[PDB]
Amino acid sequence: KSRLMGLEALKSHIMAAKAVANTMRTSLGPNGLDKMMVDKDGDVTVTNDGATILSMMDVDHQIAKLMVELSKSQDDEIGDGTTGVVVLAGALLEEAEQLLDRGIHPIRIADGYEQAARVAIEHLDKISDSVLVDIKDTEPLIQTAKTTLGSKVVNSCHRQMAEIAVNAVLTVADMERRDVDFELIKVEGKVGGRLEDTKLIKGVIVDKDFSHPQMPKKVEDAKIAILTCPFEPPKPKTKHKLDVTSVEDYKALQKYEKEKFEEMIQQIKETGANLAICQWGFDDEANHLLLQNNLPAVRWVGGPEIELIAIATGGRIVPRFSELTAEKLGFAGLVQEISFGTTKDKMLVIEQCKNSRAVTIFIRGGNKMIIEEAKRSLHDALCVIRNLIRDNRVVYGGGAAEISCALAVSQEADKCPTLEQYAMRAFADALEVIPMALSENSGMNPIQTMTEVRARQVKEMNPALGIDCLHKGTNDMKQQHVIETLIGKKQQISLATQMVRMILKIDDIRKPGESEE
Numbered sequence: 352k353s354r355l356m357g358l359e360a361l362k363s364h365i366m367a368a369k370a371v372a373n374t375m376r377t378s379l380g381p382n383g384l385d386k387m388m389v390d391k392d393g394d395v396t397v398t399n400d401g402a403t404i405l406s407m408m409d410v411d412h413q414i415a416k417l418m419v420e421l422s423k424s425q426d427d428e429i430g431d432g433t434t435g436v437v438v439l440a441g442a443l444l445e446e447a448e449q450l451l452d453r454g455i456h457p458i459r460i461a462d463g464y465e466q467a468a469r470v471a472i473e474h475l476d477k478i479s480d481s482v483l484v485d486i487k488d489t490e491p492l493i494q495t496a497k498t499t500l501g502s503k504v505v506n507s508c509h510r511q512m513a514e515i516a517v518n519a520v521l522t523v524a525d526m527e528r529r530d531v532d533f534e535l536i537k538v539e540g541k542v543g544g545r546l547e548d549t550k551l552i553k554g555v556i557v558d559k560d561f562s563h564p565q566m567p568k569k570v571e572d573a574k575i576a577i578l579t580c581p582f583e584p585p586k587p588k589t590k591h592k593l594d595v596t597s598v599e600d601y602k603a604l605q606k607y608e609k610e611k612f613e614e615m616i617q618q619i620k621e622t623g624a625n626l627a628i629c630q631w632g633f634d635d636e637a638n639h640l641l642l643q644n645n646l647p648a649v650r651w652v653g654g655p656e657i658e659l660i661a662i663a664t665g666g667r668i669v670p671r672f673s674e675l676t677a678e679k680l681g682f683a684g685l686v687q688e689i690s691f692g693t694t695k696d697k698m699l700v701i702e703q704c705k706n707s708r709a710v711t712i713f714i715r716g717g718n719k720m721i722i723e724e725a726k727r728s729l730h731d732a733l734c735v736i737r738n739l740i741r742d743n744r745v746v747y748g749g750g751a752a753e754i755s756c757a758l759a760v761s762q763e764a765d766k767c768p769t770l771e772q773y774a775m776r777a778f779a780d781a782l783e784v785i786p787m788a789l790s791e792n793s794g795m796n797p798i799q800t801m802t803e804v805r806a807r808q809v810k811e812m813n814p815a816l817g818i819d820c821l822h823k824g825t826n827d828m829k830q831q832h833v834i835e836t837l838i839g840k841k842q843q844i845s846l847a848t849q850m851v852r853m854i855l856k857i858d859d860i861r862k863p864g865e866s867e868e
């Protein structure tokens with residue numbers, strides 16, 4: 352019988368946490384090193400996302416399995432910080448070992464880590480001012496997008512992706528009362544092309560909808576008929592009812608339905624925008640009737656799909672087939688065909704030259720892994736900017752916010768006369784793993800580099816001046832362009848402390864209170 356005594360039982364978790372943290376600590380910030388991996392199919396991908404590397408590597412340890420969820424919860428809600436959450440969780444565990452050497456009970460140290468995390472999270476509301484100038488904020492957003500794509504996934508830093516990701520959000524925020532929804536920006540990424548192929552889409556891309564390839568595919572002028580009214584008889588998986596006075600009336604009813612097709616065609620044709628986009632669907636039996644008259648229509652359109660085109664132009668949607676006016680039609684600037692891959696298919700792109708309310712980033716790749724990573728680079732860039740434009744709640748992380756939170760925790764360790772005071776101090780020290788790792792990957796001495804920021808934390812409260820991540824040697828975050836969302840840093844700390852509590856819950860079956868000593 353093999354028994355793991357004390358630190359040996361925890362050493363399994365410590366080593367696994369270090370095994371991942373050793374790769375996460377080198378990927379933090381704009382100066383992070385990308386991780387290249389070859390899949391089981393011989394597919395090479397380049398990512399700097401902690402979630403991707405943890406999911407792609409073969410899991411052989413409980414920590415490696417839990418860390419996947421730790422990073423996944425970060426990109427699903429926040430985006431960036433998938434590597435930072437793991438580093439922080441590992442640092443809390445690494446310090447936990449020292450707490451055990453103090454003789455502090457394994458559960459009591461876990462209790463102290465949770466208490467310190469609560470204070471460190473709440474202290475972020477005061478860290479970093481809520482006043483941001485549109486012009487001054489535009490620059491770090493551009494630099495952030497460039498480093499997010501150019502240092503993490505794509506080594507050539509695509510100019511279009513980094514610039515469009517920022518302009519797509521800022522250009523739409525001004526026309527939407529200084530707010531941005533998810534329908535104003537879209538990232539289009541398809542496998543079948545090449546990674547170097549990137550295009551600027553001024554509007555949105557819509558997939559052509561035809562019930563039969565034998566029917567002619569017509570494309571015309573830059574006018575889109577966005578209709579909610581029934582342009583083709585609806586059939587939501589059910590059947591209509593017949594109400595006729597006589598057999599002759601039924602024959603007249605069959606002709607009446609045919610006449611309705613002709614009337615709807617003529618009514619829209621006299622107004623323009625022969626491409627009808629309707630949320631109502633039907634079978635192919637009526638779809639060929641509209642196509643046989645050379646009038647295409649899109650059927651079974653979802654809620655966000657019709658709203659996406661409607662918002663892209665900024666016009667209205669037609670509630671009734673009898674009421675047709677230019678104000679209820681789309682206002683497109685250029686309608687052209689865009690190729691899908693190189694040989695597979697073609698998509699119809701509707702661009703706007705008057706109101707850029709929907710800016711789409713069009714990227715291609717020859718590998719599913721690289722296209723998803725390219726989209727993730729845009730996901731992080733678009734999430735940070737989306738929150739900073741919607742609200743001015745920003746955190747200057749990377750050593751400034753972390754040291755400030757460390758002080759807030761240490762102060763409680765001195766105010767609280769209890770046994771957990773040492774565990775809380777350990778948490779405050781663990782917060783410094785981030786600036787440490789950011790300077791550890793660089794040529795700078797992390798100890799001497801963090802010395803200035805720590806001294807500044809004493810001199811002034813809630814500093815926005817941390818260590819540089821561009822290797823410039825200037826201790827700032829407003830000139831180094833290292834900005835994150837306030838909620839993002841809160842999520843990183845909240846998730847990391849949860850990991851600690853779960854692994855330092857050694858064998859207690861019933862959930863206890865924070866028992867005294």
